[PDB]
Each structure stands twice: as structure tokens, then as C-alpha cells.
Write a protein that binds this ligand. Structure first.
Ligand SMILES: OC[C@H]1CCN1c1nc(-c2cnn(C3CCNCC3)c2)cc(C(F)(F)F)n1
Ligand SMILES: OC[C@H]1CCN1c1nc(-c2cnn(C3CCNCC3)c2)cc(C(F)(F)F)n1
Lengths: 305, 298
């Protein structure tokens, strides 16, 4: 291969999770099975929750690194270039010898704005705990895990905890986790991290009707001292920490809503960033809603700050 | 290397393929079984098939330099397809499509991105050395321009002993009225069922009877009709038919038409009769429909 540069100790924010090639087509009308139609436009975009958050971290001004699986090939080359175009360190990518780099096909109806999605296959193995054990952690000041292969990720999280017990308080690595998909295996992740993000979608699937209901009803699952965070689209976001005080920020809707895809990852990355800079939970919550609301007014990530 | 090659002129497209269990209903989400990239486009797919059948062949179409064209070029070369005649553009992107292939019945849904890449022109064609080709196949698209290319082929043919004439075929695949003048050129004219049905015809037989009027004296009109096989009609006025050769499980019909046309060209180029070529075309297209992609049809 090649070489990478010196990363100062304790300098980077790491996001672990999915990166995917999304091929997004805008169409006149939903295509009938077995038809051949011409789209209005097509775009290839780098997507994935962890992947989107690393783009936002870089544009906020943080050194950031992505860890996730790819296979050699033209899909990965496209994704790697797109990561580097957004200033993201890809040295910790876990290259796989079996499977395909994830690629999804997203069909957007120009009539009604409906999205029809053929999601990537699951041929590529996820980063494992044994792959994680081989990573020197000292260059990272924060590690964010997108909940995916949870039993493996639990071991990574226990590895980080084991690291932090030996560290003086200023070399402790802060940890966050996101539980974004309503899948039962992910729920054990609530019990790890200093910050846990839970999605509106998961909260609803668990029967909660508001962010307030979700935080009060799930706080019992987090580890002692942790902050639980739940954004609720246009209703803004709440956070709840050990002091029992429910914090809220309203949303900051833009003049016109252009593109809400990735708004959730923008919020997550901006809360992480604000907390990593030493701000209070209430300040981070507000900043996260402001950056996410700005993003919803813009196509993609350009111009978000 | 004098009239020993088959040239196909038309599109080359990056086909980004997802193989699914079921075609997703509007506004839903389904996960695919597997993903791959394929070099596609009609003339391009026909080159793949000629190459697998062992015919030296060449492709000519527009490509824009880029990572995508590099994938496409590498694929052409792995199959031994000659790309020397490619019309490299400096304006436009390489066209690409999302192809959803239904694993259950081999249905294929194509969402094509036309990148306003400029077409191969009469003037590009002008620069081509016709002496290496025994057969030239043209995928109808930019009619008036291609008509010039066809006129150029005829003119070259006149200057030639019947021992060394270049056989020509034309495909009219898309139902655009612009293309209908192309029926008037070529030894072999391929008309698609989509075109035929668009012109009010309800079977290959009716279509061939209905459209034979429009081909040039001596030409063979060929109309494939998916699972119903294919029919042909030559100057003698006798209808010819071939049953299809359906695999017991149809898994991938993307490129079935192109396989059929290449196989028909290959067979005629080898001196087989029209009847035999039509059977061979259905045989290879049938074998293809039972496989993902093109490997293994021979
Ligand atoms: O996302 C993080 C939260 C914290 C503040 N974020 C915020 N999210 C959204 C947002 C997210 N998903 N959607 C879609 C829109 C179509 N219907 C389904 C929901 C809108 C809008 C705004 C707003 F515009 F309000 F500013 N802000
Ligand atoms: O294509 C050239 C023709 C001559 C013999 N070819 C042949 N084509 C097909 C074929 C083409 N499109 N479709 C779809 C199937 C779902 N409904 C819409 C049409 C099937 C199938 C077979 C068969 F399987 F029958 F062998 N053979």
C-alpha cells in the first residue's frame, strides 16, 4: 500500500459504522416492473450514518476518522475519494476480501417526492471486535459508534472502557453510541457510552409518542452518569442526564426545506462536536438543532457552517 | 485482418445492477440479494456475446474519459473487444443506469441516465477503415447521422467484388419515428416487439408482414417476441419461425435481446441459413436468461 501521517495523540473524533454508495435517481413516474425509463437526474452520493457524521465533523473543523468495512473495487475508490474530498481520515477502514462494498439504489418520484429504495446487500462483514482490538486508541479523543453488529460492538465498547480505566481524566476517551434502527439486538447498546442517541423511529417503535416520553421511559437503560439524547425532527430535540432534568431545544427550520436527508447525522455530529469542545449539554443540544436546521435548507452538506 | 472482424456501433453504459427477490412497491424499501456492475448498452452487450462466441469483434461508440470509462474499457479488453474506434468525447459523463433484476422471473427494470454525451457522427464514421470488417451492426439512435454511415457502407460495397462485400445489420429497438428510415438499409433488419406493438402489430408474424414493405430489396426482417421465440421474413416471402429455448428458471433477461441479435449475426456471418441463425439466436438468448450476466452461455 503506502503510508499515513502522524496524528497528534488525543486529537481525532472517530465514527464507526456504515458507509454506502447511494445511486439516487429522480424520475417522472415510478417505473413499472420490466420497463426501461430515462431519469430526470442521477447522483452518486456517499451515505451511511457514521459516514455522514464524519463529513459534518470535518466541516465543523474537527480532525475526524471513519472506521467501517469496504471491499477493494471501484465502489470503494469512489467512496474513499469522496471521504478525502470532505477531509476525512480513512486509515482505519477495515478492508475485506469477501463481499461487496454496500451500494443502494434510491428512486425519487418527481411527482409526489416519494422514495423507493433497493437497499445494499449484506455480503460485506461488519468490523469485528477482533479487528477493533488491533487499533491503537490514543490518537482519538472521542469515539462514536453507530449501532449495527451490537454483540461485537459491545466488546469494542468494553475495550474502550478498559483503556479509560488506566487513563488520567484528561486522556479519557469520550464515547457515544447511536441506536437508530428499531432492531432488538441494538437495545443492549443503551447501556454503553457517555452519550446515547436514540432515534424518533426507535422511540415510536417502542410506543413512545414524544421525545419527553422516550427519554423518561428509556433513561433507566443507560449507564450511570450517561446523557440520553432524542431528536424529534421539526419538534427539535431533548436530552436527559443524571440530574434528572429534561433539557429541550426547539428546531431552527430554514426559510425553505430543501433536503432533510442526513439531518439526523448532522445533529448527532454537531452535538458530539459541541460536547467535545467542552460545552454544556444544553448548549450542545441547541447547537445540534441549529446546524441540522440549517442543513435542511441546503442540498447535501455544502454551506452547513 | 481484412474483413475478419464484426463491428458494432451503438451505446456502452455502466449497468449498476441489483438482484432482488421481488420488485419493490412504490414508496417501500427492500434489500437486494446481490449487487454487481456490468458493462452494458445494446451494441456493447452484443460485443460481449460475439466475443464469447469466438468472433473477433470491435465496438464503436462515445465514451468520456473518467473512472467509469476505465472500468468499461478494462471490461472490453478482458473480453478481447477492440476499442480502437471509440469516439472519445471531452464534453459529458459516461451514461449509467440502475438495473433492478427480479430473480423470480428475470424481469429487468432499467433507470437510464442519459448524460447528453454526443453520439457517434457520420464524420467519426468517415475516419473508420472499413476493410477490417466482414459485418457491421448499427444500433439505431441518431438516425440521419447513421443513415450517412450506412450510405457510406453501400458506396464502399459497390467498389467491391461480391467476394468481399460488407454485410450490414440495423436494430430499430426504441419506438421513435426518427428511426423508421433505418428499415431501408442493411441486409438484416432487427425490429423489436416494443416497436411492433407500438405500430399496432400483435405478433411477430403480423409485424413482419406489416413492415416488410419498408426494407430494401433483398433484406431479411427479423422480429423476436420474447418467450414466443422469433420470426424472420426474407425476399422469398416465406415466414420463418423458431420456438424459444426457455431455461426451467428464468433469472436474468437483461441483455437477452442483444444476445439474440449477436447470435443471429454470428450465425449468418458463418454462412448458416436464416432458419438456422434464428434458432441459434433463440438458443443462446434462452441459455443467457437462465444465468446472471453473460459468462457461461457457451
Ligand atoms: O433531524 C434532527 C432534528 C433536531 C433538529 N432537527 C431537524 N430535523 C428536521 C427533519 C428530520 N427529518 N425530517 C423529515 C421531514 C419529512 N417528514 C419526516 C421527517 C425533518 C427538520 C428540522 C427543522 F426543519 F425543523 F428545522 N430540524
Ligand atoms: O429476447 C430475444 C428472444 C428470442 C428468444 N428470446 C428470449 N427472450 C426472452 C425474454 C425477453 N424479455 N423477456 C421478459 C420476461 C418477463 N415478461 C416480459 C418480457 C423474456 C426470454 C426467452 C426465453 F426464456 F423464453 F427463452 N427467450
Amino acid at each position: 500500500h503506502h503510508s499515513s501521517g502522524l496524528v497528534p495523540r488525543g486529537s481525532q473524533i472517530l465514527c464507526v459504522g456504515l458507509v454506502v454508495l447511494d445511486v439516487i435517481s429522480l424520475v417522472d413516474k415510478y417505473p413499472k416492473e420490466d420497463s426501461e425509463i430515462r431519469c430526470l437526474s442521477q447522483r452518486w452520493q456517499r451515505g451511511g450514518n457514521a459516514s455522514n457524521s464524519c463529513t459534518v465533523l470535518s466541516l465543523l473543523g474537527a480532525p475526524c476518522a471513519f472506521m467501517g468495512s469496504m471491499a477493494p473495487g471501484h465502489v470503494a475508490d469512489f467512496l474513499v475519494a469522496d471521504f478525502r474530498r470532505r477531509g476525512v481520515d480513512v486509515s482505519q477502514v477495515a478492508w475485506q476480501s469477501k463481499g461487496d462494498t454496500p451500494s443502494s439504489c434510491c428512486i425519487i418520484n418527481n411527482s409526489n417526492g416519494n422514495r423507493t429504495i433497493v437497499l445494499h446487500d449484506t455480503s460485506l462483514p461488519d468490523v469485528s471486535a477482533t479487528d477493533f482490538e488491533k487499533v491503537d486508541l490514543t490518537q482519538f479523543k472521542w469515539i462514536h459508534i453507530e449501532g449495527r453488529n451490537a454483540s461485537e460492538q459491545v466488546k469494542m465498547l468494553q475495550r474502550i472502557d478498559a483503556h479509560n480505566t488506566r487513563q488520567p481524566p484528561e486522556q479519557k476517551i469520550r464515547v457515544s453510541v447511536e441506536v437508530e434502527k428499531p432492531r432488538e439486538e441494538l437495545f443492549q447498546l443503551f447501556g454503553y457510552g457517555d452519550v446515547v442517541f436514540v432515534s424518533k423511529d426507535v422511540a415510536k417503535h417502542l410506543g413512545f409518542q414524544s421525545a419527553e416520553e422516550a427519554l423518561r421511559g428509556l433513561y433507566g437503560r443507560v449507564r450511570k452518569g450517561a446523557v440520553l439524547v432524542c431528536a424529534w425532527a421539526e419538534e427539535g430535540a431533548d436530552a436527559l442526564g443524571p440530574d434528572g432534568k429534561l433539557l429541550h431545544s426547539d428546531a431552527f427550520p430554514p426559510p425553505r426545506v430543501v433536503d432533510t436527508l442526513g439531518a439526523g447525522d448532522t445533529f448527532n455530529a454537531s452535538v458530539i462536536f459541541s460536547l467535545s469542545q467542552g460545552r454544556s449539554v444544553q448548549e450542545a443540544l441547541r447547537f445540534g438543532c441549529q446546524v441540522a436546521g440549517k442543513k435542511c435548507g441546503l442540498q447535501g452538506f455544502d454551506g452547513i457552517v
